[PDB]
Amino acid sequence: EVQLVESGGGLIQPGGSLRLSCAASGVTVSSNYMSWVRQAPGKGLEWISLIYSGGSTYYADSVKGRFTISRDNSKNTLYLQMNSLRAEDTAVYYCARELDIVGATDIWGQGTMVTVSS
Amino acid sequence: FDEVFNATRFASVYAWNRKRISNCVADYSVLYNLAPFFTFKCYGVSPTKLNDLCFTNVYADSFVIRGDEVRQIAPGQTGNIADYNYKLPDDFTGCVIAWNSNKLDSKVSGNYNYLYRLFRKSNLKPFERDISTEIYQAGNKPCNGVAGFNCYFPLRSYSFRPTYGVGHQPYRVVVLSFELLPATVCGPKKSTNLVKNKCVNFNFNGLKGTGVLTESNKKFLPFQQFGRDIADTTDAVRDP
Amino acid sequence: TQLPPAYTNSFTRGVYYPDKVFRSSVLHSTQDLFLPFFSNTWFHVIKRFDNPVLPFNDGVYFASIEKSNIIRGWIFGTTLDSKTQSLLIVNNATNVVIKVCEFQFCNDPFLDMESEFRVYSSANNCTFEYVSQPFLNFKNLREFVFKNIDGYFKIYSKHTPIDLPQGFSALEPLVDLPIGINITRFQTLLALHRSGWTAGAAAYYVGYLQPRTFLLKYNENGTITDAVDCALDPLSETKCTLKSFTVEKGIYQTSNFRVQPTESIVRFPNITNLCP
Amino acid sequence: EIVLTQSPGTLSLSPGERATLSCRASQSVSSSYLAWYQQKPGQAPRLLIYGASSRATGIPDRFSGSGSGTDFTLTISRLEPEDFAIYYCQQYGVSPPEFTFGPGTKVEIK
Ligand SMILES: *[C@@H]1O[C@H](CO)[C@@H](O)[C@H](O)[C@H]1NC(C)=O
C-alpha cells in the first residue's frame, strides 16, 4: 500500500511556528517530486511549495520566504517548516505525490488541520 | 557558427553535442540581426562589450527541446531539464538561443528521435554528464537488465507531432559557453582601411604605434610577419 | 637489444627561428630551448627489434635521414593510454592529420594488389578533431623539432639537397598547435615494406635541447644564416657576449668564476652520555 | 500566470445522466498539462485524469478528459451517487511552478 499521513498541525497564534510532518509508505520521496497543497475553509486549493527529487525547492509568493521545506532520508517523512503565521494561513494542509512527467498529483494524504488564531 | 545553428538534425537534450569553437573570428552581429530565434537571452554578457571582447575558448552546445522547456535554460532556474539533462551554472556568463523548428523536427506519425532524461538518481555536479541508460532501481528489487515494475528506462521520447501545440513544438536550442582561462577567439574588430603619408595610430595583428604608413618596395620572406631596425624599433608590417 | 648508441659529430643541426619577426643584418640572442653543438648520436637499422622509448624531456630534435617513406609517425603523450588524452602523428597517402581523442593503441601496429582495409577498429570517445595541409651524398633529408612551450606544439621543416657533411640549414615554422597539455614521453615506430623480407637502409638522430643562448645572424632577406652556442667553448662565449661572429683579436670580459660550495657544516656545543 | 476558469460553478443533475465540466485556461496550455481531481466534503482531492486524456489507476472509464490549448473538458458518461462532490481542475506552468487550480464546480443530485 502507498499512502501519506500528515501530522504536525494544531492551533497556533499569529506569528507562531510549526513543522508539518507527513510520512510516506510504499514510495521513496527522495526519488520523486513532492508538493504541499492547502485548502482554506470554503475556498479552492492553493499550492504552497514543491521540492524536486533534485533538491530544488520553489514556493508561491504568498508563502515565499516565510516557510522552509526539508526532507529526511532516514525516515521517509516530509517536513514543512512553518513560520511567521498570519490569520488566513488557517487551512487543511495536504502533502501529495507528483507523478513526474509534469503536472499530475495522484497520491494525497488524509489532511491535517492548521488554525492560526489568537 | 552556421554549422551549429543550421545543422540538419541536432543531438537530444540528454546527450547534447559539445563543439569546441576556437581559432576564428566571431560575427555575433548576425545573430541579433537574425530575428529568427524564439528565445534570445544573454545573462552574463551584454551586447555592447560582447562583440569586441576576447576569450580563451568558446564551446557550442546545441540540442532540441520543447517550447515549454526552453525557459528552464537559465542560470538559477532548475527543473526536469536543468537538473538531469543539462544544468547551467548559476554564474552563467553567456547566451541562450532557441528557435522553433516544428518544420524539421516533427513527423506526421510522431518524431520519437529526440529524448530526454526524465528520472535520474541524484542531481548533477558542475561539468557532469549522465549518458548512462542504466535501468532505474526505483525500489528494493535489483534490476537484472530487464524492464518492469521498479525497473524503468531512464530515457523517454518526446511526443513531437505537428498537430501539437506551441509548447510541444520542437524548439532548437544552441548555447555558446563563454569562459576565459592566449586569445584565439575574437570578434570582427573592424579592419579599417589604412592611410598613406600620415603618422597615425594603427592596429596591425595586435601591434600599435605611431608613424607614417607609406608605400614600400621591399621584398621580405613570406613567413616573417614584421621587421625591426638596428635600434629594435618596428619599421614595417604585413597587412593581411 | 639494449646497446649504448654510438656518437659522432652532430655539427650544427636544430637551429630554428624564435618567432615570426624579420631581422636584417643584425644579431639577436635568445634564451630558449637549444641543442648543444658538436655534441654527444647516430642510430642504425640492421629477429631484430629496436623500439626505444625516449622521454621527450625539455626538448628533442628528431631529424630523419629517410628515403622511400619508412618512418611514418611517433606516439606522443604523458602515459600513452586512454585514461589521458594523447597525441599522435600519421602521414597517410592522402594528407597529414593530427588528432586529439582516446583510441585503442596497438602495441605493434604495422602494414600488411591490396584488398585488406584494417586501419582502425572502433571510435568510442572523441572530443575534438584537427586537419592540416599534406606535408608530403644523401639526396633526401627531413628535419623536425618537437617543442611544448606553454602548451604549444610546433613543427619545423627544411629540405636542402646536398664523413657526414658540415653545413647550415634553418628550420622553417609550419604549424603551431596550442595543445595545452604536458608532453614528457614519445617513441618512434616504422612500417613493414615488401618488394624473404628486406629492411631499408636508414638512420635517425636523437639529441636533446636544453636552455641556453645562441647568436642568430639574419641575411638581408631574413634567413637564419649562422648560429653559435653560447657555452660551447670560450670562443663561443666570446662571440655570444660580444654579439658578433667576427670577433677581433682582443681581451674581453666573459663572466665570473664561482667556487663550488662543497658542503654545509654546522657546529654547536652539546652534551652526550649513554644514559641507561 | 495561467488562470483556470471552470464552468459551470454548479451543475445539478440526476444519477445516470451525463455530466460535462469545462475548465478553460487564461493561456494556451502546452498540450494538456492538466490534472483532474475528485474532492468530497471532508476528504482529500482524488486524481482521475493526467494529461487531460489519460485516466489514472483505479479510475472508472465513465470519466474521460478532452482538451488542448486553452479549453479542456470532462465528460462523465453516467453520474453515480458516489461521484457527486466538488471538483477542481489543475494545470502546470514551467518557468514558475504554477499549480493553478480552477474555481471549482459543485455537482448536486437533482
Ligand atoms: C545559416 O546560414 C546562412 C548562410 O546563408 C548564414 O548567413 C546564417 O548566419 C546561418 N544561421 C545562423 C543562425 O547563423
Interchain proximity B165–D33, CB inside 8 Å: no
C12, C31, C57, C104, C255 from C207: Cα distances, Å = 12, 18, 11, 30, 28
First to last CA, chain C: 59
d(CA A81, CA A77): 13
Cβ–ligand 1 distance for B54 under 6 Å, the answer no
**Which residue's CA is the closest to the ligand 1 atom numbered 10?**
B2
Burial zone of D21 (CB within 10 Å; 0-12 exposed, 13-18 middle, 19+ buried): buried
**Which residue's CA is the closest to the ligand 1 atom numbered 13?**
B5
Q: DSSP letter for D20, please.
A: E
CB-based contact (8 Å) between B71 and chain D? yes
Report the SS3 class of residue B32.
Answer: helix
Of all helices (H) and strands (E), which one includes residue C238? helix C234-242
- Please answer whether residues B84 and B117 qualify as being in contact, where contact means their C-beta atoms are separated by less than 8 angstroms: yes
Cβ–ligand 1 distance for B35 under 6 Å, the answer no
Q: What are the residues facing D55 on neighbouring strands?
A: D49
- Please answer whether residues C152 and C179 qualify as being in contact, where contact means their C-beta atoms are separated by less than 8 angstroms: yes
Chain A, nearest residue to D35 by Cα: A104
Cβ–ligand 1 distance for B1 under 6 Å, the answer yes
Task: Write out the DSSP string of C17-67.
Answer: -SSSEE--S-EE--EEEEPPTT--------------EEE-TT-EE--BB-S
Residues with their C more than 2.5 Å from the N of the next written residue in chain D, i.e. before a break, are none
- Please answer whether residues C148 and C78 qualify as being in contact, where contact means their C-beta atoms are separated by less than 8 angstroms: no
Distance from the B227 Cα atom to the nearest Cα atom in chain D, whole angstroms:
59
d(CA C186, CA C145): 13
First to last CA, chain B: 23
Ramachandran angles phi, psi of B85, nearest 5°: -105, -50
Residues with Cβ within 8 Å of residue C54, at least 6 apart in sequence: C60, C185, C186, C187, C206
Cβ–ligand 1 distance for B99 under 6 Å, the answer no
Cβ–ligand 1 distance for B25 under 6 Å, the answer no
Report the SS3 class of residue A104.
Answer: coil
Cβ–ligand 1 distance for B30 under 6 Å, the answer yes
d(CA A52, CA A30): 8
Q: Which of B69, B71, B78, B149 to mutate to test the interface with A (most CBs of A within 10 A)?
A: B78
**Which residue's CA is the closest to the ligand 1 atom numbered 8?**
B2
Chains B and C: how many Cβ contacts under 8 Å?
40
What b/e sequence results for B156-166 when a residue is b if at least 16 CB atoms lie within 10 Å of its CB, and e otherwise? bebebbeebbb
d(CA A28, CA D50): 21
* Closest alpha carbon to C29 in C217, C254, C221, C248: C217
Q: What are the residues facing D46 on neighbouring strands?
A: D38
Q: Which of B219, B223, B225, B229 to mutate to test the interface with C (most CBs of C within 10 A)?
A: B223
Ramachandran angles phi, psi of D91, nearest 5°: -130, 170
Cell, residue C263? 658542503
Q: Which among B118, B121, B139 has the least Cβ separation from residue A100?
A: B118
Q: Which positions in chain B touch C21 (Cβ < 8 Å)? A: 224-228
* Closest alpha carbon to A51 in A66, A26, A72, A74: A72
Amino acid at C135: F
Q: Which among B68, B164, B168 has the least Cβ separation from residue D94?
A: B68
How many beta carbons lie within 10 A of that of residue B104, not counting itself? 15
Q: Is the peptide bond before D8 cis (omega within 30 degrees of 0)?
A: yes
Interchain proximity A31–B123, CB inside 8 Å: no
Amino acid at B118: L
Strands B199-204 and C31-34, sheet pairing: unpaired
d(CA B22, CA B181): 13
Strands (E), chain C: 21-22, 27-28, 31-34, 53-55, 60-61, 73-77, 86-90, 97-102, 125-128, 145-149, 152-157, 172-177, 185-189, 210-213, 216-218, 224-226
- Please answer whether residues C247 and C260 qualify as being in contact, where contact means their C-beta atoms are separated by less than 8 angstroms: no
Amino acid at C143: E
> How was it solved?
cryo-EM
Of all helices (H) and strands (E), which one includes residue D46? strand D46-50
A92, B17, B178, B222, C260 from B61: Cα distances, Å = 46, 6, 11, 38, 59
d(CA D4, CA D23): 6
A65, A67, A101, B22, B87 from B77: Cα distances, Å = 17, 20, 18, 29, 9
Amino acid at C205: Y
Cβ–ligand 1 distance for B152 under 6 Å, the answer no
Ligand 1 atom with least separation from CA of B1: 14
d(CA D42, CA A87): 21
- Please answer whether residues B15 and B131 qualify as being in contact, where contact means their C-beta atoms are separated by less than 8 angstroms: yes
Q: Which positions in chain B touch C22 (Cβ < 8 Å)? A: 220-221, 224-228, 236
Distance from the B161 Cα atom to the nearest Cα atom in chain C, whole angstroms:
33
d(CA C18, CA C156): 11
- Please answer whether residues D6 and D103 qualify as being in contact, where contact means their C-beta atoms are separated by less than 8 angstroms: yes
d(CA B211, CA B145): 75
Q: Which positions in chain B touch C17 (Cβ < 8 Å)? A: 223
Burial zone of B103 (CB within 10 Å; 0-12 exposed, 13-18 middle, 19+ buried): exposed
Residues with Cβ within 8 Å of residue C211, at least 6 apart in sequence: C31, C32, C33, C34, C58
Q: Tell me the CA–centroid distance for residue B176 and ligand 1, in Å.
A: 16
Mutate to test the pocket of ligand 1, among B1, B3, B4, B6 (most ligand atoms within 8 A of CB): B6
